[PDB]
Write an enzyme that holds these catalytic residues in place. Structure first.
Site, PDB file in Angstrom:
ATOM      1  N   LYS A  49      38.552  15.715  20.591  1.00 18.08           N
ATOM      2  CA  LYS A  49      38.794  15.518  22.037  1.00 18.08           C
ATOM      3  C   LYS A  49      39.900  14.485  22.357  1.00 18.08           C
ATOM      4  CE  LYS A  49      34.100  16.827  23.645  1.00 18.08           C
ATOM      5  NZ  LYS A  49      33.225  16.704  24.852  1.00 18.08           N
ATOM      6  N   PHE A  90      39.892   8.878   9.100  1.00 20.13           N
ATOM      7  CA  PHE A  90      39.600   8.198   7.839  1.00 20.13           C
ATOM      8  C   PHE A  90      38.090   8.052   7.661  1.00 20.13           C
ATOM      9  CE2 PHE A  90      38.731   3.426   7.317  1.00 20.13           C
ATOM     10  CZ  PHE A  90      38.447   3.417   5.967  1.00 20.13           C
ATOM     11  N   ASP A  95      32.696   9.869   5.648  1.00 18.99           N
ATOM     12  CA  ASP A  95      31.293  10.068   6.054  1.00 18.99           C
ATOM     13  C   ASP A  95      30.800  11.461   5.695  1.00 18.99           C
ATOM     14  OD1 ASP A  95      31.243   7.481   7.004  1.00 18.99           O
ATOM     15  OD2 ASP A  95      31.271   8.016   9.148  1.00 18.99           O
ATOM     16  N   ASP A  99      27.565  11.975   3.304  1.00 20.40           N
ATOM     17  CA  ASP A  99      26.316  12.597   3.741  1.00 20.40           C
ATOM     18  C   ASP A  99      26.237  14.082   3.432  1.00 20.40           C
ATOM     19  OD1 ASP A  99      27.777  13.772   5.817  1.00 20.40           O
ATOM     20  OD2 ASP A  99      27.133  12.261   7.303  1.00 20.40           O
ATOM     21  N   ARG A 104      32.683  20.108  10.352  1.00 24.87           N
ATOM     22  CA  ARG A 104      33.143  19.051  11.254  1.00 24.87           C
ATOM     23  C   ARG A 104      33.984  19.772  12.329  1.00 24.87           C
ATOM     24  NH1 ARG A 104      32.295  13.949  12.918  1.00 24.87           N
ATOM     25  NH2 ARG A 104      31.657  13.385  10.793  1.00 24.87           N
ATOM     26  N   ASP A 166      23.501   1.556   7.996  1.00 21.14           N
ATOM     27  CA  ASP A 166      23.012   2.914   8.178  1.00 21.14           C
ATOM     28  C   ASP A 166      22.488   3.521   6.865  1.00 21.14           C
ATOM     29  OD1 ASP A 166      22.470   4.970  10.042  1.00 21.14           O
ATOM     30  OD2 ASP A 166      24.359   6.018   9.542  1.00 21.14           O
ATOM     31  N   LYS A 192      28.593   0.346  13.460  1.00 16.50           N
ATOM     32  CA  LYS A 192      29.133   1.643  13.047  1.00 16.50           C
ATOM     33  C   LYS A 192      29.912   2.422  14.117  1.00 16.50           C
ATOM     34  CE  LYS A 192      27.966   6.032  10.911  1.00 16.50           C
ATOM     35  NZ  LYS A 192      26.885   6.911  10.406  1.00 16.50           N
ATOM     36  N   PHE A 231      26.235   5.291  25.030  1.00 17.11           N
ATOM     37  CA  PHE A 231      26.903   6.473  24.485  1.00 17.11           C
ATOM     38  C   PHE A 231      26.134   7.088  23.320  1.00 17.11           C
ATOM     39  CE2 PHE A 231      30.031   8.913  22.014  1.00 17.11           C
ATOM     40  CZ  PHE A 231      30.419   9.801  22.992  1.00 17.11           C
ATOM     41  N   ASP A 235      23.801  10.444  23.019  1.00 16.60           N
ATOM     42  CA  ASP A 235      24.144  11.354  21.923  1.00 16.60           C
ATOM     43  C   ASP A 235      22.884  11.766  21.116  1.00 16.60           C
ATOM     44  OD1 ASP A 235      26.827  12.356  20.664  1.00 16.60           O
ATOM     45  OD2 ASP A 235      25.723  11.639  18.901  1.00 16.60           O
ATOM     46  N   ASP A 236      21.995  10.792  20.817  1.00 16.46           N
ATOM     47  CA  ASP A 236      20.727  11.025  20.099  1.00 16.46           C
ATOM     48  C   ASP A 236      19.758  11.820  20.962  1.00 16.46           C
ATOM     49  OD1 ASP A 236      22.023   9.293  18.363  1.00 16.46           O
ATOM     50  OD2 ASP A 236      20.441   7.780  18.349  1.00 16.46           O
TER      51      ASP A 236
HETATM   52  O1  LIG Z   1      33.163  12.740  20.155  1.00 18.42           O
HETATM   53  C1  LIG Z   1      33.493  13.381  21.142  1.00 18.42           C
HETATM   54  O2  LIG Z   1      33.972  14.624  21.036  1.00 18.42           O
HETATM   55  C2  LIG Z   1      33.349  12.749  22.467  1.00 18.42           C
HETATM   56  C3  LIG Z   1      33.751  11.509  22.786  1.00 18.42           C
HETATM   57  C4  LIG Z   1      33.358  11.285  24.224  1.00 18.42           C
HETATM   58  C5  LIG Z   1      33.487  10.216  25.128  1.00 18.42           C
HETATM   59  C6  LIG Z   1      34.153   8.954  24.705  1.00 18.42           C
HETATM   60  C7  LIG Z   1      33.757   8.236  23.553  1.00 18.42           C
HETATM   61  C8  LIG Z   1      34.437   7.072  23.136  1.00 18.42           C
HETATM   62  C9  LIG Z   1      35.512   6.554  23.883  1.00 18.42           C
HETATM   63  C10 LIG Z   1      35.891   7.270  25.025  1.00 18.42           C
HETATM   64  N1  LIG Z   1      36.886   7.011  25.888  1.00 18.42           N
HETATM   65  C11 LIG Z   1      36.943   7.904  26.842  1.00 18.42           C
HETATM   66  C12 LIG Z   1      35.987   8.828  26.667  1.00 18.42           C
HETATM   67  C13 LIG Z   1      35.236   8.427  25.423  1.00 18.42           C
HETATM   68  C14 LIG Z   1      32.970  10.423  26.426  1.00 18.42           C
HETATM   69  C15 LIG Z   1      32.359  11.645  26.785  1.00 18.42           C
HETATM   70  C16 LIG Z   1      32.235  12.700  25.857  1.00 18.42           C
HETATM   71  C17 LIG Z   1      32.749  12.486  24.568  1.00 18.42           C
HETATM   72  N2  LIG Z   1      32.765  13.310  23.498  1.00 18.42           N
END
Ligand SMILES: O=C(O)c1cc2c(-c3cccc4[nH]ccc34)cccc2[nH]1
Ligand SMILES: O=C(O)c1cc2c(-c3cccc4[nH]ccc34)cccc2[nH]1
Lengths: 342, 342
Positions: A49, A90, A95, A99, A104, A166, A192, A231, A235-236
């Protein structure tokens, strides 16, 4: 702010590659090695992204006077953004080896490609080496040169410390939920993920802007590390209770014995009987056993515990921005918060 | 010069460890990670000859006025020496994983230890991270700070480029002697071994001495890269024709399809018939087939070709020292040459 800039940022990768593979011009002896480096960059730094790298560009535009945003200032911003993406590339390459991952971003992990294997350990080191090559090529004569070198090195070290923490917490072949504490979970996330994903890209933009004061960085770090904690918790949660259509991913965290926020809460709320059910089903591949944990989480109303945590977190982050953004424009942090929340 | 200093250098490792594990004081959350880092340092940075690290201390003593060699100047010299040893430890831990090695210095490779495995990829990254942590802790306020950071980063990059070149030349499962050329052999040696083993430790001592001029470094590099080429050529010769009592090692290079100096020369001298014999026996484990290559090398009088190369090389290095040592004391290079030759 991100959607506009994405194009100029992604278009800059071809220059990044050209400049990194231009080593071959003065030394054609290492041409084959340079050809391989080009493949590694092209496979591992593309397809994500670019959010972390884009944060550098977006924050640079909001921190620097538009009259000081000349062709070269933006060229360095795009490069430093690409350095954040190379630091990530990297870590991911390495990783995935550690694992034993298969895919990916829906594609085969670099190390899983025929004729690559454990050679990917060297490839991951080269991705790391490119950061410092780019900082030299683009920022050698800039006053923040050393500041950026130190920030990338400290970000590498924190992430590696986080990775150790971890690997110590969830060994492959060791299903022990006693080491899965909230305090440990919070430490793994800080080290991490939160330092390189949130602090590093804003701090890089800050140094490029001339904002090098320990106070300002400490203030920015306080907001960003809390954003990084939410964040990963989100995610979890989304890993299991998130719709796979909207997320574009399917849950595996239970099968992998991950120190997930969901298990941490479950353990805090489970009775001695409920503890035993989780002690059996967690870490197993079977779709019947994976269904049992999802049901136990649902029974302990963890989706509601999350929903409450999300509201409490947004409230806290806004109070954090209000108290620690100054003298930076609050829109630097508000932009991230809007993207992270919902 | 080395035998005296060895003791003070090895005694400094306990301080290096204390200072690196003192991170735990301010942050006890990462204590387990720090405990693991201590194990990695203690297993991987100890047990070698310390020659590369000692070169930093020896060269510092010969380049700096004795009146400027205060307690702290020597403390930094010992640390920078230990940084060279940590750069090496990082490469060896990783190389042992990549080439599936069993032992290193007669002991089990770190990754082969029960409960370690591919986690050693992160451990190798931490060894790398420690260099920059030590340079910060000891040299942050020194005028050569940035010079040392750049030199270690460039040494990492050259070695990694050398490793790529090596991995490309001898793939595990590809017995092709067409890619085994003298020019390729010389390139692998320059990049994978000569830069970090010879140039890096002298250049580090030079920067610490205030000798930062491109001319002086280019002159020192010219001698040191030639010393590095002989060192590895000698190593490839001793691997097979060296007495295992004196060397303290037993030959395996033929069994592993290595781009060794011995095979390069053999290929340059072998008739179409002689090429075929080497095409069959090279890369095979069997003691009967390994005996056939040793016999072919002996038949092509490669031990004599080596003996002649050794005399020509010593002659060349002495002319190199004579022409490029100034303004450095020639004893800086003569010390290394005495150790490398015979
Ligand atoms: O891993 C992904 O694909 C993903 C990252 C992210 C982030 C995110 C994470 C870290 C710094 C950031 N700065 C601006 C956005 C962002 C936010 C939302 C969805 C997301 N998906
Ligand atoms: O690998 C070994 O054990 C080993 C190294 C060496 C070196 C050597 C290599 C690189 C830089 C040096 N500076 C001072 C000595 C030296 C020389 C002789 C035997 C050796 N054995």
């Amino acid at each position: 702010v991100y959607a506009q800039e994405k194009q100029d940022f992604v278009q800059h990768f071809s220059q990044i590659v050209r400049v990194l593979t231009e080593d071959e011009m003065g030394h054609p002896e290492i041409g084959d090695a340079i050809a391989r480096l080009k493949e590694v960059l092209e496979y591992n730094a593309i397809g994500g992204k670019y959010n972390r790298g884009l944060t550098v560009v977006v924050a640079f535009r909001e921190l620097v006077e538009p009259r000081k945003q000349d062709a070269d200032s933006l060229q360095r911003a795009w490069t430093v953004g690409w350095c954040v993406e190379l630091l990530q590339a990297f870590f991911l390459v390495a990783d995935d080896i550690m694992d034993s991952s298969l895919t990916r971003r829906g594609q085969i992990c670099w190390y899983q490609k025929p004729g690559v294997g454990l050679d990917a350990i060297n490839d991951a080191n080269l991705l790391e080496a490119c950061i410092y090559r780019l900082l030299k090529l683009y920022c050698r004569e800039q006053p923040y040169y050393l500041n950026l070198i130190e920030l990338f090195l400290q970000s590498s070290y924190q992430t590696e410390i986080g990775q150790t923490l971890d690997l110590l917490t969830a060994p492959q072949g060791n299903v022990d939920l006693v080491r899965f504490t909230e305090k440990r979970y919070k430490s793994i996330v800080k080290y991490k993920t939160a330092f390189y994903s949130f602090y590093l890209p804003i701090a890089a933009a800050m140094y490029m802007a001339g904002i090098d004061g320990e106070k300002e960085h400490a203030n920015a770090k306080k907001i960003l590390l809390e954003m990084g904690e939410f964040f990963q918790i989100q995610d979890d949660y989304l890993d299991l209770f998130g719709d796979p259509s909207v997320t574009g991913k399917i849950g595996t965290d239970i099968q992998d014995n991950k120190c997930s926020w969901l298990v941490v809460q479950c353990l805090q709320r489970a009775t001695p009987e409920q503890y035993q059910i989780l002690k059996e089903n967690y870490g197993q591949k079977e779709a019947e056993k994976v269904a049992r944990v999802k049901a136990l989480y649902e029974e302990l109303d963890l989706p509601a515990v999350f929903l409450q945590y999300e509201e409490d977190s947004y409230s806290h982050i806004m109070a954090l921005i209000e108290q620690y953004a100054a003298p930076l424009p609050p829109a630097v942090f508000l932009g991230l918060a809007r993207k992270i929340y919902k």
